[PDB]
Structure formats: structure tokens, C-alpha cells
Design a protein around this ligand. Structure first.
Ligand code: CL
Lengths: 87, 93, 88
């Protein structure tokens, strides 16, 4: 019936949205891993530059991304909790 | 009952979609803040390294430092966040 | 006309979800371009610092590899492309 088409399309919407949620979780998890790597690399190279300049007035800048990565984790958790079970 | 149940499921889909919109906005805004901080730090350390090499060669070859410009990318992230903001669902029931 | 309203709302949900898919694709593509530039810049300046320290004696430098992460972002973007809704 047209109502059966309504039910089918509604199930399709739920299916597509849940798959898209999976994709977004992947994207944000990967962005967080990359941000961790970026923070660590910049801070290691800042420490290297500071050590070298100390050997021989140069101040190096350090990166702190903890709050941002925590926020990304919270967003991923919300995405996990936003899955849909049609009755 | 399929009728009222269908209406219930439609409201549930709208609710979940709007919550997910909130989560995505949070993620992209936080990514933008992190990119701003990364750009600023990399450029500060590039300036420090250039200062050291210039200070030294005038006290053997020039080392060229690379600068980071993420402004267009952060503008695009802001546009995506705005579109996500405008994509909320207001059902008619 | 509750059913016609139900169909109307269903089309609205699909329309909004697809528009949001477009926004997410834009965000992740731009984040990947930014990660490309960040990796390249950090590695270029790492090479510069290693060169300076090598010549000034003629410290361990750290290099960044984000390739797996960027490949993963591209996969997420592709799945987002494939998640579009064509209602009947
Ligand atoms: Cl529906």
C-alpha cells in the first residue's frame, strides 16, 4: 500500500542515516589520531629546536590539543548514541 | 496502529538527526580551533628557526622555513558548520 | 490528510539529511587538505632544522606521517557520498 511504501522509505532513511553515522565516527576518530600525531611532532621538534639553541634568545612554542581531542571524543560518543531503531 | 507508529518513528528520526547535527557541529568547530592552534604554533616555530639561522649566519648556507596558511580551510569548515546549522528538521505533526 | 503530511515530512527528512551529507563531505575534504599541508610544513621545517644542526657541527628531529589517516578520511567521505536517500 502507499502506507507500505511509507514504511519502506522510513526504514531506508533509518538505514542510510545509521551508515552515515558510522562514516562520521570514522572521520572524527581519524582526525583525532592525526591531531595527536601533529601535537606530538610539533612539540618534539620545538624541544629539539630549544635544545639546539640552548647549546650555542629563541623561545619555542608548544602545542596543547587535549581539550580539542576530548571534545572530538565526546562528539563521537554522541554520534554513537544517535543510532535509530524504528519500531 | 501502523499509522500512529509511523508518525512516532518519523519524529524519532527527526530527533536523532538533530542530535547528530549537534555532534557534527561540535566536532567541526573543535577541529577548526585545533587547526588554528596548529597553524599558529608551526608558524611561530618557523619564525624562531629562521631567527636562529639568520642570527647565526651573521655572527653556513641559508635554510628556508615553511609557513602554514590554513585560512581558506577554516573558512570552509565554518561554511560546513553553518550548513549543518541550517539543516535542522521541523516536522509538521 | 495525515498520510499526505507524513509523506511530506518524509521527503523533508530526506532532503535535509542529504543537504547535511553535502556539508559533512565539505568539512572532511577540507580537513584532509589541511592535514596534507600541516604534514608537509612540519616535515619541511623538520628537514630545515636537521640541516642546520648538521651543518653547525660539520639533536633528533621528528617527522610526521598522516597518510593512513588521510586515506581513512577519504573512505569516510566516499561512504558519506554513498549514503544518499532516494525515496520512492
Ligand atoms: Cl519517515
Amino acid at each position: 500500500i502507499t502506507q507500505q511504501v511509507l514504511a519502506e522509505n522510513q526504514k531506508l532513511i533509518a538505514n542510510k542515516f545509521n551508515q552515515a553515522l558510522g562514516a562520521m565516527q570514522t572521520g572524527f576518530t581519524t582526525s583525532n589520531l592525526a591531531f595527536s600525531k601533529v601535537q606530538d611532532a610539533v612539540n618534539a621538534n620545538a624541544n629539539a629546536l630549544s635544545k639546539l639553541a640552548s647549546e650555542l634568545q629563541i623561545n619555542v612554542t608548544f602545542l596543547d590539543l587535549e581539550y580539542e581531542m576530548k571534545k572530538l571524543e565526546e562528539a563521537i560518543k554522541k554520534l554513537e548514541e544517535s543510532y535509530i531503531d524504528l519500531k
